[PDB]
Design a protein around this ligand. Structure first.
Ligand SMILES: CCOC(=O)CC[C@H](C[C@@H]1CCNC1=O)NC(=O)[C@@H](CC(=O)[C@@H](NC(=O)c1cc(C)on1)C(C)C)Cc1ccc(F)cc1
Length: 176
């Protein structure tokens, strides 16, 4: 129920020069993407070209790569504010669902099971922190996917090795 309404109201198909991604709209004109999507000044959102007002790579007190980029979109439409569904602290989970929505992989829900603390992750040679892991064969095209569990939004899909998948953890304070 919660995953379905999240998909409808907040999860959008996008394309950058790096390919297809799922984008989570967070509130108003603010949305989050995996860093490796490398959004430019213009982004493709559901068959429309959209101006990107600002893009900031997510940094926390530690000053390390979290593999997320916050963008502000030049749009009329305002995302439903879902920050209250993002935990105040990075949260592991059981019975999690990955919500993917791109032009090539539209509106798909994947039960990934337990989402456990993982932390540091070397993603194709690039150091990444505060990740969590699920034992599910995620694949190319699923980055940006939104990890959800029991009414909470807990991560964004960023990588996998064919047998396991990994997400960047989400905390409410990222979007304050
Ligand atoms: C161009 C296509 O891009 C996409 O489709 C983005 C979505 C995917 C989905 C992967 C695609 C596959 N199974 C998955 O779940 N992500 C990646 O491909 C990335 C890297 C991998 O996952 C690497 N995995 C690990 O390093 C890795 C380490 C451990 C441990 O587990 N995986 C590759 C070796 C697959 C892209 C990337 C490159 C440089 C970075 F700075 C950061 C990220």
């Amino acid at each position: 129920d919660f995953a379905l309404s999240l998909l409808r109201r907040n999860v959008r198909q996008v394309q950058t020069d790096q390919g297809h991604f799922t984008m989570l709209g967070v509130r108003d004109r603010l949305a989050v993407l995996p860093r490796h999507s490398q959004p430019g000044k213009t982004i493709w959102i559901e068959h429309k070209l959209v101006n990107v007002l600002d893009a900031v790579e997510l940094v926390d007190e530690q000053g390390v790569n979290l593999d997320l980029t916050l963008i502000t979109l030049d749009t009329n439409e305002k995302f439903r504010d879902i920050t209250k569904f993002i935990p105040e602290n990075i949260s592991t989970a059981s019975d999690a669902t990955l919500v993917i929505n791109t032009e090539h992989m539209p509106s798909m829900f994947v039960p990934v099971g337990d989402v456990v603390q993982y932390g540091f992750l070397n993603l194709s040679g690039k150091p990444t922190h505060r990740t969590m892991m699920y034992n599910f064969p995620t694949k190319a095209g699923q980055c940006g996917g939104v990890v959800t569990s029991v009414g909470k939004i807990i991560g964004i899909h960023i990588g996998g090795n064919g047998r396991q998948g990994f997400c960047a953890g989400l905390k409410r304070s990222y979007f304050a």
